[PDB]
Design brief:
The structure is a homotetramer of 191-residue chains.
Chain A (H helix, E strand, L loop, with lengths): L11 E6 L12 H17 L4 E8 L17 E6 L7 H4 L7 E6 L5 H11 L3 E5 L8 H11 L6 E4 L1 H8 L8 H8 L8
Parallel strand pairs in A: 1-2, 1-4, 2-3, 4-5, 5-6
Helix pairs in contact in A: 1-6
Protein name (chains A, B, C, D): Ribonuclease mar1
Family (chains A, B, C, D): Belongs to the isochorismatase family.
Organism (chains A, B, C, D): Leishmania major
C-alpha cells in the first residue's frame, strides 16, 4: 500500500476544510484551493458510490461561511465545529466504513495539520494535494508540509492531478472519459 | 503521539537558549527569535501550572547577557553554563517531571542542535518553532534543520503559531480568549 | 544494499517511459529526458548480457509515438499500453529474472509515480535519474519527487552521471573506457 | 548515538577525498572544500591521539595531484586508487579500530557517494560537512545530498563549524582554546 487504490476498492472521503470568506483575501493560493475543491466535487459526483464529500465550517457566525465560488455536491455532508482539528463526533462516526481520506483546504499549519494527525491515529490513509493547500504565511506553511512529509507510509503529499490518476489505474477505465474532463481545466494560479 | 498534547496533559518546558547581546547583530532573524521568546513567555504566564520557562546563558561575563528586549516571566529559571548543549546538572533535575520541551533560540547548528539531541536521549518530546530559530550563516542553519527533521517521531519542527494552536485543541477552550491575543501580534520580520 | 551493484551482479532493466511526440513541447526538460534515454541506450549496448531496454508507448494512435531523437537499441523491447503504471502483463513476465530497474521518462507525478510504486511491490530495486525525469508543471513534479525520496531503502533518486559510475565501481574496469565516452557528452539543457 | 561523541571517546578518521588539480576550476565551491580540508587538518594536529588524517588520490598521473593550497599534517596517510569508492584494501585495514569517519571532498554524486555507502556497510558512523563538499553540476550534487540525508541514523550532513563543536561538548574543554582559533577563520566563499 504505497499509493491510492482504484476507486472501486474500499471507501474514500474527500474533506474540504474551512475554505471560508474570512480567509479569501488573506491567502495567496486561496483560488487554487477553491479550484481543487471543485475538481474533487465533480469527481465525487462521477463515482458517488465509493466516495463521500465532507465540508467543515469553523466558527461560522464569526467571520466564516463556505465561499460561493465552490459548488458543493447534493450529497455533501457539511458540519460546523469549533475544534481546530476536523475530527468531531459528527465526522468520527461518518468514517466508520471509510479507509481513505483526501484532506484539502486551509490552514496547512493549523486546521489541516491537526486533522491529518488525528486521521493517522484512526488508521486512515490520508492523501493530501499540495495543489489545494495554503497558509497566510509561507514559513508557517513550509514547516508544516516538511513535517507531514515525514509521517509516511500512511501520509502522502502530491497534487490534485496525480491523485485523480492514482484512482484511475487505466486510461481505458469506464469512467476515464468523464474524469479526463476535469484534468483539462486550468487552475487560476499557474502550477 | 504525533503532535503536542493539550496543555493540561503532562508537563511542557519552554527553553530560551543563549539569546544574548553578542549575537544580536550577527544574526539576521534575531528579532524574530526575540518575538517568539516573548510569545512563549506570555503563553507560559497564561498556563503556569503545566508549563516551565527556562533561560540559558552561555559564558555571560565574556560577551553574553539575555537581551533586554525579552521580558522574562517572574517564574523563569535562568541558569548559566559553559557546555554548548543546554543539558547541565541544574536543568537535568528540573526535567524529572516534564514530558515535553519547546526549544527555541540560537545557534541552530551549535547550541540548539546538541541540546535537542540530548533531550531526545532523555525520552523527551521536543518541538521546535523554526519561527524562533536562527544562525549566523544560512548554510550552517539549513544543514542543521534538514538533520533535526529526520529525528522523528520524537522531534518536530513547525512554527510558533502552529505550536500554540496544537496545545489548544479547541477554539472554545477556556484559555483561547487569552491565547488568541498572542497570535494577533506581528513579528518584526515578515514570515 | 544501498547503491547500484556492479553491472555483473544480477540483472538490471532500463525503462524509457512514454517519451512521445505529444509531450515534446509541453515539458521544459524534455530534451534532457531524451539525452538520458540515449545515454542509457548506448550503455545498454556496452553490457547487453546483464541489461535490458524497455520502451513504453501510452495510447499511441491518439497523440503518441516514441520521439525520433532517441535511437533505440536493436534488442529493445517496445510495448504499448493504456494503463498509466508501466506494469502490464507483457513487462511483468519480462522482469521474472531482473533484480534492478532504472525508470526514466515522463510524467513524474503520473506514469512514473505509479510505475515505481508497482515496481516496489515486486521487490525490485528502483533507481531513478532525476536527470532524465520531467513534468508539465513544476508543482506536480516537485511533490512527486519529494514523495519517492521517502520510499527508501529500495527507491533512490540520483542523476544519470552518478548511476553509470555506480555500476562501474572501478575506473580500471574493462568497460570503463567505453563508459567514460558517455559521461563526456553534453546534455542540451545545462545541469 | 545521534551526534559526534567527544573526541576522547573512540577513534575518528578524517577523509580528504580527490581534492586534485584537475577539479580546481571545474567546481564552484572548490575553495571552500580546500578551506574545510585545512580546518580539519589543523584540528587533527590538536588531538592526534584519537584522530587520523587520510588523503585519497584518484588516477594521479592522469590529471590528478593534491592541491598545494592544502597543507597536510605530517601524520597524514595518503594513498592512491582507481576505484571511485575510497574503500580500498589499504584504507580498509586502517579503519579496523576507527568508529567514526569525517568524509569531505569531491564529487558528491560520484566518489563521495560510493565511499559513504561502503562506510555505512562497515558499521562506521559517517559525518559529512556540506561545508566542504562539491560537484561540477548543481543537479548532480543536490540529488546526491538529498539521498545521503535519508541514510540515517548512521549518516549525518551538517557543516564544518557544527562538527568541531560536536566533538568539544564544553567551552571549558582543555583544547577549546586551540579549537576556537579555527572557527574564527573566514572561508573564501561566504556561507
Amino acid at each position: 500500500s504505497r499509493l491510492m487504490p482504484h476507486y472501486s476498492k474500499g471507501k474514500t472521503a474527500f474533506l474540504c476544510v474551512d475554505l471560508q470568506e474570512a480567509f479569501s483575501k488573506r491567502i495567496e493560493n486561496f483560488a487554487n484551493c477553491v479550484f481543487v475543491a471543485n475538481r474533487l466535487a465533480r469527481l465525487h459526483e462521477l463515482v458517488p458510490e465509493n466516495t463521500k464529500y465532507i465540508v467543515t465550517e469553523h466558527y461560522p457566525k464569526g467571520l466564516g461561511r463556505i465561499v460561493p465560488g465552490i459548488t458543493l455536491p447534493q450529497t455533501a455532508h457539511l458540519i460546523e465545529k469549533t475544534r481546530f482539528s476536523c475530527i468531531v463526533p459528527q465526522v468520527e462516526e461518518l468514517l466508520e466504513d471509510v479507509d481513505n481520506a483526501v484532506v484539502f483546504g486551509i490552514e496547512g499549519h493549523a486546521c489541516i495539520l491537526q486533522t491529518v494527525a488525528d486521521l493517522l491515529d484512526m488508521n486512515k490513509r490520508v492523501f493530501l494535494p499540495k495543489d489545494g493547500l495554503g497558509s497566510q504565511k509561507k514559513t508557517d506553511f513550509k514547516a508544516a508540509m516538511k513535517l507531514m512529509g515525514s509521517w509516511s507510509p500512511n501520509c502522502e503529499i502530491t497534487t490534485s492531478e496525480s491523485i485523480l490518476l492514482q484512482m484511475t489505474k487505466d486510461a481505458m477505465d469506464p469512467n476515464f472519459k468523464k474524469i479526463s474532463k476535469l484534468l483539462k481545466e486550468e487552475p487560476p494560479i499557474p502550477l
